[PDB]
C-alpha cells in the first residue's frame, strides 16, 4: 500500500489554475479520508492546509483517487504540497510531493 | 533493480554485515560462530559486485532467495531447505524457537576479555552479536546493533579502569537485563503480528504514541503507526535488512517533522544513526495541549457517533483511543485498550436500537470500575511491599498455589522478577506507576506463556495465552 502523487513538479504563473492528483494504490481497503500539507520554501516543516477559498478537493472513492485544485495562484501558493490518505482500516501514508514553482 | 545492492548502499558495509550475521544466527542458532562468519563474508562479497554492476548475474534475486540459498548450504532438523521461496522462509520462521536452550554463557575473566577486545575488536564484537542473536531469535535487530555499540563502549572505558571488573561487570549485567526485557517485548509483538495480524499491534501503537506525542494530529500519529507497523512486520518476518532501513527512514521522517510531532525531540535528532533511533523510541511524553474538550462531545453527544462507527470502525475506535490516551499518560496501555474494547462493545449493541443515544449515554460510567481495578490492585501490592521488603517470597506462595502444574525452579525465577517490579516502579509518583508497572508485568507473563507452551502441563495457564486481558486472567485465578 502506498499513495501515488502526481505531478512531481509544476510551473505556473500568478492567476493560473493548478491540479494535483493522488491515488491510494495496492490495497484492498477503501479510501476513508484525505489531508493536504504545504511545505514552504525553506522546507524545515509541513503545515496542514484547509480546503476552502481558492483550494478545492474532489474525492472519488471508487478509484481511491483524490485531487487538489488551486484556482487562482497567488505568490504564497508556490511551495511543496503533500497529500496523505487514510484507509477505513487506519492505514495512513503520504504522497511523494509536488513542487509548485513560478514560471 | 538489485535489492541487495540497494540495501548494501542504504545500510553501509559495517551494518550490512552485522545485520546479515544476526539473520543467520537467528535462523541457524546451533551453528558455530566460524560457520556464520564464512556465509556472511560470502554474501557480503556477492553484494559488493552488485553494487558495482547492478546487471551482474543473480543480482536481481530476492533477499530470501539469496540468503535462504546460503543458509541451506551448511552441512535442529530442517526440511525447509527442500522448499522453494516463499514457502522456505515461512518454514524457517516456524522452526525458529526461543525454547531450544543452549547452556548459559560463561564469561572469561575480565583481563582475558579486555585482552581479546584489544587484539581483535571486530571478531570480539561479532561474537557478541552472534551469541545474543542465537539465544534470542526474536531480538529486534536494529536495536541489537545499538546494544553492540553500548557493549563496545563499556569495554572502551572499563578496560583502562583501576578495577576493570568493578567498572565493567555492572555495565554488562545491566545490558543483559535490558536485553532480556527488550527481547521479551519484541517476542510478544512478533507473536501477535504472526498469529492475529496487524490490528492488535496498531491499537497498542495508537495508544502508546498518543501518550508520547499528545500534540500531534490524529492523522500524523496514524501515519507514524503505519510506518512502525511496517518496520515491525519486516523484522518479525526475518526481513532484517528492510526492517533496519525502514526504521532509519522513520527516524529521519520524525526528525524532519518534529513540529508536527513533539517538542521533546530536538536532542534525539542531533545524535548519530543507531542512538538517534534508540533515543526517539525512549523519548519522554510531551505535554498535552492545554484546553482539550471532554470526550463526551465527540463520542457521546455527537449525532454522528453511530454513523462514524458503522462507516469506519477502526478509524473511529482509533480516534477514541487517540483522544483518550493523549489525555491519560498516567494510564497503562492495556487499560486504555480495555476502555476502547468496552466502548466498542457498547456501540455494537446500541447502534442497532431505535434511539442509540438513549442506550449509550452513560457509557463513560462503565469506565469507572475499569480505571479503579488496576489503580487499587497496584496501590495494595505497592503498600504491601512498602512494609515487607524486596526479599518476593509472598508472591511465590500465592502464584504457586494458583498453578502448581508448572516446574518449581521456573516458578521461582518468575517471582524474583516480580519483586523487581515494585522495586523501582513504586519509587516513582502515582501518575507514572501504572505505565511502567502494568505494562512490564504483562510482558513478564508472556515469558511465562511461551516457556510453558513448549512443555505443556497445565490447561489453565494456556487458556490465558487476549493480550489485553492477560493480567485479569492470571491475577484473578484462585
Query: What single-letter DSSP state applies at residue B121?
Result: H
**Residue for grid cell 472513492:** A61
Among A80, A90, A94, which would you mutate to test the B interface (most chain B Cβ atoms within 10 Å of its Cβ)?
Answer: A90
Binding-site residues of B for Ca(2+) = 3, 10, 234, 239, 242, 245, 249
Which segments of B425-469 does DSSP mark as H helices, in order?
A: 433-454, 461-464
A12 touches chain B (CB under 8 A): no
- Structural contact between residues B246 and B227, judged by C-beta atoms closer than 8 angstroms: yes
- Structural contact between residues B259 and B231, judged by C-beta atoms closer than 8 angstroms: no
Query: What single-letter DSSP state applies at residue B303?
Result: T
- Structural contact between residues B153 and B168, judged by C-beta atoms closer than 8 angstroms: no
- Structural contact between residues B200 and B467, judged by C-beta atoms closer than 8 angstroms: yes
* Residue B448 CB coordination number (10 Å): 23
What are the chain B neighbours of A44 within 8 Å (beta carbons)?
A: 256, 259
Whether residue B257 and residue A86 make contact (CB cut-off 8 A), yes or no, is no
CA B200 from chain center: how many Å? Answer: 13
A55 touches chain B (CB under 8 A): no
The closest alpha carbon to B221, from B229, B143, B233, belongs to B229
What are the chain A neighbours of B259 within 8 Å (beta carbons)?
A: 44-45
Domains of chain A: 1-103 (2.60.40.10)
Rounded to a whole number, what is the distance in Å from the CA of B70 to chain A's nearest CA?
30
Q: Which residue of A has its CA nearest to B206?
A: A90
Cα separation, B40 vs B122, whole angstroms: 14
CA dihedral B118, B120, B124, B126 (to 10 degrees): 140
Query: What single-letter DSSP state applies at residue A94?
Result: E
Cα separation, B350 vs B305, whole angstroms: 11
Question: Which region, left, alpha or beta, applies to residue A64 given φ > 0 means left and ψ of -120 to 50 means alpha?
Answer: left
State phi, psi for A3 to the nearest 5 degrees.
-115, 120
- Burial readout B323-346 (b: 16 or more C-beta within 10 A, e: otherwise): bbbbbbbbbbbbbbbbbbbbbeeb
Rounded to a whole number, what is the distance in Å from the CA of B443 to chain A's nearest CA?
26
**C-alpha grid cell for residue B198?**
496487524
Q: Helix B33-52 vs helix B3-11: angle between axes, to the nearest 10 degrees? A: 100
Per DSSP (E only), the strands in B114-234 are none
Listing DSSP states for B244-301 in one string gives HHHHHHHHHHHHHTGGGT-STTTTGGGS-HHHHHHHHHHPPPPPPPS-PPPTHIIIII
**Residue for grid cell 552485522:** B18
- According to DSSP, the β-strands at A98-102 and A9-12 are parallel
A46 touches chain B (CB under 8 A): yes
Listing DSSP states for B212-254 in one string gives H-TTS-HHHHHHHHHHHHHHHHHHHTT-HHHHHHHHHHHHHHH
CA B262 from chain center: how many Å? Answer: 22
CA dihedral B293, B294, B297, B298 (to 10 degrees): 90
- Structural contact between residues B127 and B181, judged by C-beta atoms closer than 8 angstroms: no
Whether residue A45 and residue B260 make contact (CB cut-off 8 A), yes or no, is yes
Please report the resolution in angstroms.
2.3
**Residue for grid cell 515491525:** B232
Whether residue B206 and residue A89 make contact (CB cut-off 8 A), yes or no, is no
Whether residue A90 and residue B225 make contact (CB cut-off 8 A), yes or no, is yes
Whether residue A84 and residue B259 make contact (CB cut-off 8 A), yes or no, is no
**Residue for grid cell 554463557:** B105
Query: What single-letter DSSP state applies at residue B105?
Result: P
Interface of B with A (CB under 8 A): 202, 206, 217, 219, 222-223, 225-226, 256-260, 311-315, 318
Burial class (CB in 10 A: 0-12, 13-18, 19+), B188: buried
The partner residues of B357 in beta bridges, in order of sequence, read none
What are the chain B neighbours of A50 within 8 Å (beta carbons)?
A: none
Whether residue B226 and residue A92 make contact (CB cut-off 8 A), yes or no, is yes
Binding-site residues of B for (4Z,15Z)-bilirubin IXalpha = 230
Domains of chain B: 1-195 (no CATH), 196-287 (1.10.246.10), 288-478 (no CATH)
Whether residue A35 and residue B219 make contact (CB cut-off 8 A), yes or no, is yes
Cα separation, B395 vs B415, whole angstroms: 6
**Residue for grid cell 505535554:** B287
Instruction: Mention every residue, 6+ apart, whose C-beta is less than 8 A from residue B80.
Output: B72, B88, B91, B92, B95
Cα separation, B331 vs B322, whole angstroms: 13
Cα separation, B424 vs B227, whole angstroms: 32
Cα separation, A84 vs A75, whole angstroms: 24
CA B62 from chain center: how many Å? Answer: 27
Amino acid at each position: 500500500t502506498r499513495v501515488d502523487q502526481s505531478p512531481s513538479s509544476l510551473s505556473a504563473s500568478v492567476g493560473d489554475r493548478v491540479t494535483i492528483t493522488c491515488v491510494l494504490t495496492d490495497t484492498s481497503y477503501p479510501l476513508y479520508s484525505t489531508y493536504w500539507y504545504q511545505q514552504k520554501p525553506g522546507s524545515s516543516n509541513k503545515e496542514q492546509i484547509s480546503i476552502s477559498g481558492r483550494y478545492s478537493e474532489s474525492v472519488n472513492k471508487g478509484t481511491k483517487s483524490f485531487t487538489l485544485t488551486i484556482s487562482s495562484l497567488q505568490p504564497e501558493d508556490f511551495a511543496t504540497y503533500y497529500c496523505r490518505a487514510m484507509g477505513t482500516n487506519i492505514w495512513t501514508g503520504d504522497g511523494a510531493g509536488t513542487k509548485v514553482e513560478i514560471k | 533493480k538489485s535489492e541487495v545492492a540497494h540495501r548494501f548502499k542504504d545500510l553501509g558495509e559495517e551494518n550490512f554485515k552485522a545485520l546479515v550475521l544476526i539473520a543467520f544466527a537467528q535462523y541457524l542458532q546451533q551453528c558455530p560462530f566460524e560457520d556464520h562468519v564464512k556465509l556472511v563474508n560470502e554474501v557480503t562479497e556477492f553484494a559488493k559486485t552488485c553494487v558495482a554492476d547492478e546487471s551482474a548475474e543473480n543480482c536481481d534475486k530476492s533477499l530470501h532467495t539469496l540468503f535462504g540459498d546460503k543458509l541451506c548450504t551448511v552441512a535442529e532438523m530442517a526440511d525447509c531447505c527442500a522448499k522453494q521461496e516463499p514457502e522456505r522462509n515461512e518454514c524457517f520462521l516456524q522452526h525458529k524457537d526461543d525454547n531450544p536452550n543452549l547452556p548459559r554463557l560463561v564469561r572469561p575473566e575480565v583481563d582475558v576479555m579486555c585482552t581479546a577486545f584489544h587484539d581483535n575488536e571486530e571478531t570480539f564484537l561479532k561474537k557478541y552479536l552472534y551469541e545474543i542473536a542465537r539465544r534470542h531469535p526474536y531480538f529486534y535487530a536494529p536495536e541489537l546493533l545499538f546494544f553492540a555499540k553500548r557493549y563496545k563502549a563499556a569495554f572502551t572505558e572499563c578496560c583502562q579502569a583501576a578495577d576493570k571488573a568493578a567498572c565493567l561487570l555492572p555495565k554488562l549485567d545491566e545490558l543483559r537485563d535490558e536485553g532480556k526485557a527488550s527481547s521479551a517485548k519484541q517476542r510478544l509483538k512478533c507473536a501477535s503480528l504472526q498469529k492475529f495480524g496487524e490490528r492488535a499491534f496498531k491499537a497498542w501503537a495508537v495508544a502508546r504514541l498518543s501518550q508520547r506525542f499528545p500534540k500531534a494530529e490524529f492523522a500524523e500519529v496514524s501515519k507514524l503507526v503505519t510506518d512502525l507497523t511496517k518496520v515491525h512486520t519486516e523484522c518479525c518476518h526475518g526481513d532484517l535488512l528492510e526492517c533496519a532501513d525502514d526504521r532509519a527512514d522513520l527516524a529521519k521522517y520524525i526528525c524532519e517533522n518534529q513540529d508536527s510531532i513533539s517538542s521533546k525531540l530536538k536532542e534525539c535528532c542531533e545524535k548519530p544513526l543507531l542512538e538517534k533511533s534508540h533515543c526517539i523510541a525512549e523519548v519522554e511524553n510531551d505535554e498535552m495541549p492545554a484546553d482539550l474538550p471532554s470526550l463526551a462531545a465527540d463520542f457521546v453527544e455527537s449525532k454522528d457517533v453511530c454513523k462514524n462507527y458503522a462507516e469506519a470502525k477502526d478509524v473511529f475506535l482509533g480516534m477514541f483511543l487517540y483522544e483518550y490516551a493523549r489525555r491519560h499518560p498516567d494510564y497503562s496501555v492495556v487499560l486504555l485498550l480495555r476502555l476502547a474494547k468496552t466502548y466498542e462493545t457498547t456501540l455494537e449493541k446500541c447502534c442497532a436500537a431505535a434511539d442509540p443515544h438513549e442506550c449509550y449515554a452513560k457509557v463513560f460510567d462503565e469506565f469507572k470500575p475499569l480505571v479503579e481495578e488496576p489503580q487499587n490492585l497496584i496501590k495494595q501490592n505497592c503498600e504491601l511491599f512498602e512494609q515487607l521488603g524486596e526479599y518476593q517470597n509472598a508472591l511465590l506462595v500465592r502464584y504457586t498455589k494458583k498453578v502448581p502444574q508448572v516446574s518449581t525452579p521456573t516458578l521461582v525465577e518468575v517471582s524474583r522478577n516480580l519483586g523487581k517490579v515494585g522495586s523501582k516502579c513504586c519509587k516513582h509518583p502515582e501518575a507514572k506507576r501504572m505505565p511502567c508497572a502494568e505494562d512490564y508485568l504483562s510482558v513478564v507473563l508472556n515469558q511465562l506463556c511461551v516457556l510453558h507452551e513448549k512443555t505443556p502441563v497445565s490447561d489453565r495457564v494456556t487458556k490465558c495465552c487476549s493480550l489485553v486481558n492477560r493480567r485479569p486472567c492470571f491475577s484473578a485465578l484462585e
